[PDB]
Design a protein around this ligand. Structure first.
Ligand code: HEC
Length: 123
């Protein structure tokens, strides 16, 4: 279990590419980055299915087609090394992630998740 407060601060790194904008258009976190998908509603979301994002890689779509819904266990392994995670999960030797960024600290991964659990759950 992470700490939502430390998570919100560490989310600053993710803001270079991601935003968290709700369904009414309110910006919860971030500026205007569109390199990565909107993370609002990511908790429990089938991987690679945010309807507005058109930049998903084959590995990510394939992972969601094989039953990956984001929960803490997979999220933590994923942000630490996206490509390695995609290959393991899919069993596809050619899978590779578009997210070139890698989170270097494990404690941060849990913190950011606690923060997402707070502000990114769609009812
Ligand atoms: C730009 C260089 C990025 C940074 C910095 C971070 N992310 Fe990212 N993310 C980016 C892309 C281009 C993608 C698509 C990946 C693909 O292979 O298709 C993603 C995706 C995610 C996901 C998947 C969500 C989904 O809709 O299925 C997650 C959960 C995610 N990113 C989280 C995340 C976090 C928490 C970051 C900060 C530590 C982070 N990303 C940074 C691009 C970039």
């Amino acid at each position: 279990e992470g700490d939502p407060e430390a998570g919100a601060k560490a989310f600053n790194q993710c803001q270079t590419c991601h935003v968290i904008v709700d369904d009414s258009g309110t910006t919860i976190a971030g500026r205007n980055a569109k390199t990565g998908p909107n993370l609002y509603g990511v908790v429990g979301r089938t991987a690679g299915t945010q309807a507005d994002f058109k930049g998903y890689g084959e590995g990510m779509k394939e992972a969601g087609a094989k039953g990956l819904a984001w929960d803490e266990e997979h999220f933590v392994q994923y942000v630490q090394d996206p490509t390695k995670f995609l290959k393991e999960y899919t069993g596809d030797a050619k899978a590779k992630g578009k997210m070139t960024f890698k989170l270097k600290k494990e404690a941060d991964a849990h913190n950011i998740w606690a923060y997402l659990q707070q502000v990114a759950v769609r009812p």
